[PDB]
């Protein structure tokens, strides 16, 4: 399992991080993202959360937190990866999404982004 | 919100005769915080930027007096805010409403720099207080010297306009640029050479400033550093 | 225990962090945030303090700390989540309210404040 | 060990961190601040150190270090809470006062300072 | 091991970090940077990665990550050191590189680069 | 052992950090800085390094980095402290200097530096 697995780990191309949530879930801390389309197109917002003590995406929680804050202070176009069907806490899945934040790119063009993608 | 304070190294007999005025025609608002129209780039601001708090004036004085190359004096000038005096907050969100891109780096320096911008030459009729800022060799802290006081002030008691800046051009999308702050996160519109300082032919030849990039520093303070 | 529990946790929306105290209590660092409504002003200022090594919300201390600083240096209309009636040290309470700090969600104007909420 | 013990520890309000020293004493990192009044009124400055392995204020070192930097980078009004007889190293007490940095509260305007205060 | 070992650790000078990426490969997190020469003469960009738990250069992960973030936000012309033939994960090498980020030395002029260099 | 034991640790006042550097030597992530006089009358620069895993000044690394980085992003006259003849690695002491960064004051030009000068 890796951030670049195009079959399992999907991405959402050029997006900008609009909102940012931090909180405490059972056991530990967590944060959530509400990235929307950078160009302003109508798309379903990519709500992706990372929990400091849940799933296999816990060891990369601190790096992802700092880099999400960096790409939130700088409203860059970012290719946000996310593992789907990760969170099982039902109240967590009602207010947020099962998408688990696993990677956060730095799209600087309109045709390609840094990081792995589907061939 | 009133009686904004601006630091200029000129004796009162010059400023109270030939006051602050526009140094150019760039009326855009994004480049004012970025320091592109203030002594760091094109240097053609249509706005003169003044602080509403006394503390940032001492910050400016300490920043300028602590480089061993600023040969000269300094003076805090109190200016009565007129209708042509707009706070920087209720002119950014509006630009953000129409499609402006003012990121956290730009948004974090209006609270730091209590900026009030004048879209008109600061005539001498608005200046009231001229307090000399002396850098004593003892304890090395800025002290208020002689306070020039004259009857040029006109009792209107007007307040700074809390609306949007009229005729403000269309907001610039994206363009994550330099912010150019000097000293201790002081936006480089408060620098002397962000003003129209040409009264005589060789009036004021002081060292301009070294401007650094502020947004790495804002990242330094907001992050766990 | 969860930030969006909405039963034990209350929240105040559109409240910019105005003041930021930092100190040490009983051997652990702590930080309190005083926030007032960003749009004008109403009600009473909200004082919410997070203490490390104390209360069940200790693990989310640091994650909130560097976030509150972010919401302090970058004045942002945020949605502050607090756990009322958690602090018992009466000298601590007579200065800062009983509220803790459990969530800090960024919000954009009066439209779609981020983070968990109530029906 | 609260930074609200007005009987045991004092505080200087509306100061600004003018000069910032960092270093290492006795095998542990430390930082000291030189806080002067945000005016020309005061004559002697406040020297407030903080060591990361000495005395009861060590746990709050890292938390204060980030806050003091914010008040040094942004030379803004701040309420500095200090003790009185913490440091015993003779060269250290000679160079820096026995004061120990125990708290740091942002001072908004000149009407009040957040945090504990003598009534 | 050292970044100044020019016999094995190569480098490219005057390359502004253009693109950033963060994720996690296997257990620990990783970050990659794409750098193009500020002069624009070079065509093939440099792609330097760093994994927090895989390479010999793991202990320098967080510090190099912070330095990369600062050189990325400031866009300084920075000399970049990299080790060759480090990654063995085929999905990883075919996506970014076989290069490990090992040193980030700044360059204050068009012909003044600090840090180790070939004799 | 203290930054200010002027019989052992030397210092240079009103020096601007010119160029930064980060890397990794042995198991620690060293960082080095090149400093020159702010006035410009100096002839040779001073190179100061703070190897993370070695020398008695190791615990100060994390506080000497983020401070120096600041004194790099804002070119400001500071007083840098250094312990001569600390490093042993010959390739390290040919490319860089043999003195270790131990402390970082903050000068207001003239002759006012906050630290243990004692000339």
Author numbering:
A (entry chain G), C (entry chain F), D (entry chain E), E (entry chain C), F (entry chain D): 1 to 119
B (entry chain B): 6 to 230
Relevant lines from the article:
To validate the structural insights from the cryo-EM map of the endogenously expressed DiaT holotoxin, we recombinantly expressed PltBd1 homopentameric holotoxin, PltBd2 homopentameric holotoxin, and PltBd1/PltBd2 heteropentameric holotoxin in E. coli. Cryo-EM analysis resolved these structures at resolutions of 3.05 Å, 2.61 Å, and 2.94 Å, respectively. A localized distortion in the central pore was observed near Tyr70 in PltBd1, where the bulky phenolic side chain creates steric hindrance, causing contraction at this site. Pore radius measurements confirmed that the PltBd1 homopentamer exhibits the smallest pore radius with significant distortion, while the PltBd2 homopentamer displays a larger and straighter pore. Further analysis of PltA’s interactions with distinct B subunits identified a critical hydrophobic interaction between Ile227 of PltA and Ile71 of PltBd2. This interaction is weaker in the PltBd1 homopentamer due to the shorter side chain of Val73 in PltBd1. All holotoxins demonstrated cytotoxic activity, but the PltBd2 homopentamer exhibited the highest potency, approximately threefold greater than the PltBd1/PltBd2 heteropentameric toxin (DiaT) and nearly 75-fold greater than the PltBd1 homopentamer. Individual complementation with either pltBd1 or pltBd2 led to the assembly of holotoxins with homopentameric B subunits, yet neither restored the cytotoxicity of S. diarizonae. However, only PltBd1 displayed substantial binding to Neu5Gc-terminated glycans.
In this study, we identified and characterized a typhoid toxin-like A2B5 toxin, designated diarizonae toxin (DiaT), as a key virulence factor in Salmonella diarizonae. The DiaT genomic islet encodes two distinct B subunits, PltBd1 and PltBd2, which exhibit unique functional roles. Through genetic and functional analyses, we demonstrate that the heteropentameric assembly of PltBd1 and PltBd2 is essential for cytotoxicity, with our data suggesting PltBd1 facilitates toxin secretion and PltBd2 mediates host cell targeting. The holotoxin consists of a pentameric B subunit arrangement supporting a single PltA subunit, with the amphipathic C-terminal tail of PltA extending into the central pore formed by the B subunits.
